[PDB]
Amino acid sequence: ALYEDPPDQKTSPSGKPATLKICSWNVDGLRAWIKKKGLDWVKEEAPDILCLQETKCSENKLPAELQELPGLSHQYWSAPSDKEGYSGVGLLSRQCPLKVSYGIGDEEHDQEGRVIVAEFDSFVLVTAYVPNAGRGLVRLEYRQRWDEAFRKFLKGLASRKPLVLCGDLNVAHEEIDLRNPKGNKKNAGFTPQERQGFGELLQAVPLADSFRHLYPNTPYAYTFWTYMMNARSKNVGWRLDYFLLSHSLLPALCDSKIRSKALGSDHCPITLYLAL
Ligand SMILES: [Mg+2]
């Protein structure tokens, strides 16, 4: 019932050394996260680009520590206009992007600050916080609508450059991605409608589940554990955080990580190495 994240593999399949280290983490709140010393572990990872989801904090109410991160001086936030402590995503980068835009260009789905998109010389990075279908699946329909707006949106960006999607995509693709498949098929995150919406995304915007791509058979690898009953302690989790990317980027895929032990949230960070 235990999992050990293999060592960082920092070379491409052609022996090309990694040049980019992208780190994605669902902070469950910037302030609750800072307090748990998550901004600590980040300094150690020293990524090139750091995507954060569920910042629970507008861009104007940013903590002083953040702007004062060591290398990530090109920050970009996206929070719900008249809300707080709800959703929110950020994309800090050591290098300044070519262009940055927010949302997926579809009025109904750009109301909750969930997507940030940054274009870089060789590719376009897109961080996201897919909307949870909530308890009682009361937002399942909206989710099914979002899934499509996003899938379609992604395919367009894809037709311009190779694509990379870092983020909490609220869904455990296969039974191996969650500790309790047999009993969550009716709960947000593992419903047919969602699971088979993730698959159809990988299949339509030529996208690969970087982790499962490299580690087709590793189980118990999760990125989320409910604070309820120390689920993390017993490793009863869900792999909801991903790094999906264009098939034309596999040649540059070095490794895709799952920082199982970094604390600071109810999600463990996940890192990605690419040789560009
Ligand atoms: Mg949360």
Rounded Cα gap, residues 84 and 87, in angstroms? 8
Q: Which of 194, 192, 271, 184 is nearest to 231 (CA)?
A: 184
Task: Please check whether residue 125 is in contact with residue 166, taking contact to mean a CB–CB distance below 8 angstroms.
Answer: yes
Angle among Cα 214, 219, 221 to the nearest 5 degrees reads: 80
- Ligand 1 centre distance from Cα of residue 138 (Å): 18
- Ligand 1 centre distance from Cα of residue 266 (Å): 7
Dmax (CA) of the chain:
49
Binding-site residues for Mg(2+), please? 26, 54, 168, 170, 266-267
Angle among Cα 7, 12, 14 to the nearest 5 degrees reads: 135
- Ligand 1 centre distance from Cα of residue 54 (Å): 6
SS3 track for the chain: CCCCCCCCCCECCCCCECCEEEEEEECCCHHHHHHCCHHHHHHHHCCCEEEEECCCCCCCCCCHHHHCCCCCCECCEECCCCCCCCCCEEEEECCCCCEEEECCCCCCCCCCCCEEEEEECCEEEEEEECCCCCHHHCCHHHHHHHHHHHHHHHHHHHCCCCEEEEEECCCCCCHHHECCHHHCCCCCCCCHHHHHHHHHHHHHCCEEEHHHHHCCCCCCCCCEECCHHHHHHHCCEECCEEEEEEHHHHHHEEEECCCCCCCCCCECCEEEEECC
Q: Which of 34, 231, 20, 234 is nearest to 118 (CA)?
A: 20
Deposited experimental method? X-ray
Rounded Cα gap, residues 227 and 249, in angstroms? 35
- Ligand 1 centre distance from Cα of residue 265 (Å): 8
Domain ranges of the chain: 1-276
Contacting residues for 200 by C-beta, under 8 A, at least 6 apart: 151
What fold, for 1-276? Deoxyribonuclease I; Chain A (3.60.10)
Task: Please check whether residue 101 is in contact with residue 137, taking contact to mean a CB–CB distance below 8 angstroms.
Answer: no
Return the residue matching tokens 């022996």. 15
Could you tell me the resolution of this structure in angstroms?
2.8
Angle, helix 140-158 to helix 192-204, in steps of 10 degrees: 10
Rounded Cα gap, residues 119 and 164, in angstroms? 10
Q: Which of 276, 269, 217 is nearest to 249 (CA)?
A: 276
- Ligand 1 centre distance from Cα of residue 12 (Å): 33
The set of catalytic residues is: 129, 168, 267
Rounded Cα gap, residues 257 and 259, in angstroms? 6
